[PDB]
Structure formats: structure tokens, C-alpha cells
């Protein structure tokens, strides 16, 4: 909430999670805040996801500004376990990063373009 | 003395129970005579009555009843 | 005063402890009850 500065419509989120699932099967994804961080830092990240129900918030605060100084696009998600289930985990994840999509490079670009418009 | 360990172990899980209530009854009737200040006492016998019951109970425990 | 069941068991014991050293013990030891208590002169606990 302190790191969140815009709300993402449930319908958009649905699109985003659908694409991430096909991204784990086709392309490659990074699960976990740490791995997501080095992705932005190394550049290999194309689209990064960040959960909204994170407590403590310190685990994620850095993502928004970091992605900004690296040109990497990012999107929010309501629940932590939905992002984890989408990434293909028995547990939830505070954040996920699509390290080079696959069979979805089109959608990823759309979502990225859609968000920029959503501010 | 008049009752040996071997003889107790030779008993069945039922014989010891019968022999138990038997001894207990002899004891009670001894203490009944003693209660009335009876003279046909045999101090060594009443003593042995207590130990016998202890032995049978001790064996019962070892044997699983 | 009203004595309880436990209190009663204790007075009962003290009264028994008040007996004398049996005559046969004097002989077996070839020759005193230091705990002889009196209701008036002495004072039990409680």
C-alpha cells in the first residue's frame, strides 16, 4: 500500500496471471523476491509481478523504484498465494519475474503497454 | 514355610485367586480370635499368613495375573 | 471447639504415644518414655 500507487483492475490481473502460467511452461520465470531482484539488476527481467498483501512490506518496497531505474515493467496482484499458484508453487510468493516469456511475448507487451497508460 | 514359591508358580491364574481369598479368610479369623484376646495363638503362623499373601501377590504380578 | 476428621486422627495418635515403655522391654535390654505428655501441664500442637 505504501509502495502501491495505482490499482490494477481484477480483469487485468486475471490476464496477467494467465500469461505467467504459460510463461512457466513455455519460457522462463523467477519465483521469489530475491531472484526477482537480481533479474531487474541483471536486466534479464521483462515483466515483474508484485503481491499486495505482503507483511512486512520491507520485503518488496524496493521493487517499484528499482524497476523504474532499469526500464523493467511491473504489475500488482491482490493475493500472494495466487501469484505463487500461477508461478507453479505449493506456496505463495511475494513477487515473481518473467525471465524471457514464451508463447506470450505478445500479451506481456500488451499488459506492459496497458499499465503504462494506467499510470 | 508351609507354602513354597515353586508350589505357587505351579498354580493356575485361578488357583492363586482361590488360595488368596482362602489365606485372607484364615488371617481374618486369626485376628478375630486375637480381637477377643484368644489364647490358642501361634505368633509364627499369623506372621506367615501375611508373607504368603505377599508371595502369591508377587507371583501374580510376575505371571501377568 | 469442633475437631475435624484429620485433627481427630492426630489427637488419637498423641494419646497412644502417651503409653508407657512395656515391662518386657526393660528385661530384654537389661534396664524411660521421654515423650510423656499431660493434658494440663503440657501443650499439644495446633
Amino acid at each position: 500500500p505504501v509502495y502501491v500507487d495505482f490499482d490494477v483492475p481484477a480483469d487485468l490481473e486475471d490476464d496477467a496471471l494467465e500469461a505467467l502460467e504459460v510463461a512457466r511452461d513455455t519460457g522462463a520465470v523467477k519465483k521469489g523476491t530475491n531472484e526477482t531482484t537480481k533479474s531487474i539488476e541483471r536486466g534479464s527481467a521483462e515483466l515483474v509481478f508484485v503481491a499486495e498483501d505482503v507483511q512486512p512490506e520491507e520485503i518488496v518496497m524496493h521493487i517499484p523504484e528499482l524497476a523504474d531505474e532499469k526500464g523493467v515493467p511491473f504489475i500488482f496482484v491482490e493475493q500472494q498465494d495466487d501469484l505463487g499458484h500461477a508461478a507453479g508453487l505449493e506456496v505463495g510468493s511475494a513477487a515473481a519475474a518473467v525471465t524471457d516469456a514464451g508463447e506470450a511475448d505478445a500479451d506481456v507487451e500488451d499488459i506492459a503497454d496497458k499499465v503504462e497508460e494506467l499510470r | 514355610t508351609v507354602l513354597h514359591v515353586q508350589e505357587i508358580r505351579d498354580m493356575t491364574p485361578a488357583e492363586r485367586e482361590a488360595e488368596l481369598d482362602d489365606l485372607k479368610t484364615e488371617l481374618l479369623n486369626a485376628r478375630a480370635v486375637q480381637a477377643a484376646g484368644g489364647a490358642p495363638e501361634n505368633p509364627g503362623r499369623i506372621k506367615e499368613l501375611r508373607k504368603a499373601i505377599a508371595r502369591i501377590k508377587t507371583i501374580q504380578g510376575e505371571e501377568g495375573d | 471447639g469442633k475437631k475435624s476428621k484429620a485433627t481427630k486422627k492426630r489427637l488419637a495418635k498423641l494419646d497412644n504415644q502417651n503409653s508407657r515403655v512395656p515391662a518386657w522391654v526393660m528385661l530384654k535390654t537389661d534396664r524411660r518414655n521421654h515423650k510423656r505428655r499431660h493434658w494440663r501441664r503440657n501443650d499439644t500442637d495446633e
Partner: protein, 194 residues
């Protein structure tokens, strides 16, 4: 590359600046309405915890503990005293607030043992710390080559005897040379002179 953890750390160098500033303002409001010892599912400062020994595992516990700010809460002398010993106001205790929080936490969890602790801030009248406790009886820990040592009998009630980290420092055992003549191997053995 920097670990994600290095970011939690950096924010906490300046708890008064940035987002952390706004975060703290919000949190404390709920904290002031909580108890003295509140068990919490996740550490407020991941980097510090893990650095101290923390592990996302069965038998590893955390609890926030608030203690009042300031000097000793001493009662004035009631009998004869020479001027030197008539003080009340400027007297402070020899144990530090962090070591006090560690104790109040270990008493709340009589089966657990203190591992370490850190500070999570303070307002105008109280300080909050987060203690890390460990269940010496859980087999998940008894087979951990990193935490099994805290199962030994001689580790029983370790906090109350100053064997904790904040404990050993408060006992003036940091330095190995000059200035540590009366502190090592113990305060009591050196006639209580530090």
C-alpha cells in the same frame, strides 16, 4: 548483484527517512494497542534476523516486546544514607532495555530459548525489539547442524545468565585486550568491578 535483503537493511539505516518513515508511523499505532509480548509470524527485518540465526522452519519463533523508555524506576531511601546514596533521579540500571525485552520474552515462552534479538524502533516513551526463540525439544531443530547446539543442557535458561549476544556485550566482553581486565572471564569472578 545486491541481494534483495540488502535493501531491507539499507532502509533501516534511516528509519526516519523514506517509505520506512511512513511505515513506522502507521505500524506503531497498532503496536501501542498490543501487549508486552506478541508472537508474530514473520520478522519485521528479514536481513537482520537471518544474519542473527533465523530460519523459516518448525520450532523457530519470533515475538515483539515493548519496554518503557528511560532510567531506573527506583524508590527513595527509607532509612539512613550518606549523601552519595540518596539518589533517585539520575540512577540507571546496569542492564540495557534490549536485554530486558529478551527476558520478558523468554518468560512468556518457558520451553523456548533465546537465540538473539534486534531493535524495531521506538516512540517518545517506549522501545520495541524482536526476540528470536528456539524450541530445544522439536526434532526439526535437533537435526539442524546450525541450531542443534542450543539443545544442550548447559544452554538451558541461557538468557537469564547473560549468555545471549546482547548479554555478552552488556557485560563488557567485546574487547579482548585493554579495558577488559575486570570483565573477563566473568564479572562475578572479578569482584563486580565493571
Amino acid at each position: 548483484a545486491r541481494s534483495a535483503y540488502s535493501y531491507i537493511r539499507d532502509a533501516w539505516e534511516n528509519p526516519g527517512d523514506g517509505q520506512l518513515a511512513e511505515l513506522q508511523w502507521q505500524r506503531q499505532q497498532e503496536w501501542r494497542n498490543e501487549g508486552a509480548v506478541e508472537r508474530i509470524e514473520r520478522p519485521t527485518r528479514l536481513d537482520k534476523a537471518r544474519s542473527q540465526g533465523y530460519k523459516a522452519k518448525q520450532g523457530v519463533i519470533v515475538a515483539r516486546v515493548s519496554v518503557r523508555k528511560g532510567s531506573a524506576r527506583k524508590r527513595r531511601h527509607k532509612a539512613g544514607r550518606r549523601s552519595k546514596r540518596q539518589g533517585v533521579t539520575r540512577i540507571t540500571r546496569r542492564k540495557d532495555i534490549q536485554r530486558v525485552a529478551e527476558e520478558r520474552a523468554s518468560r512468556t515462552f518457558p520451553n523456548l530459548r533465546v537465540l538473539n534479538s534486534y531493535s524495531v524502533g521506538q516512540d517518545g516513551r517506549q522501545k520495541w525489539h524482536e526476540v528470536i526463540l528456539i524450541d530445544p525439544n522439536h526434532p526439526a531443530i535437533q537435526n539442524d547442524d546450525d541450531l542443534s547446539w542450543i539443545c544442550a543442557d548447559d544452554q538451558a535458561d541461557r538468557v537469564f545468565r547473560g549468555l545471549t549476544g546482547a548479554g555478552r556485550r552488556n557485560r563488557g566482553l567485546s574487547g579482548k585486550g585493554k579495558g577488559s581486565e575486570k570483565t573477563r572471564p566473568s564479572l562475578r569472578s572479578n569482584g563486580g568491578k565493571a
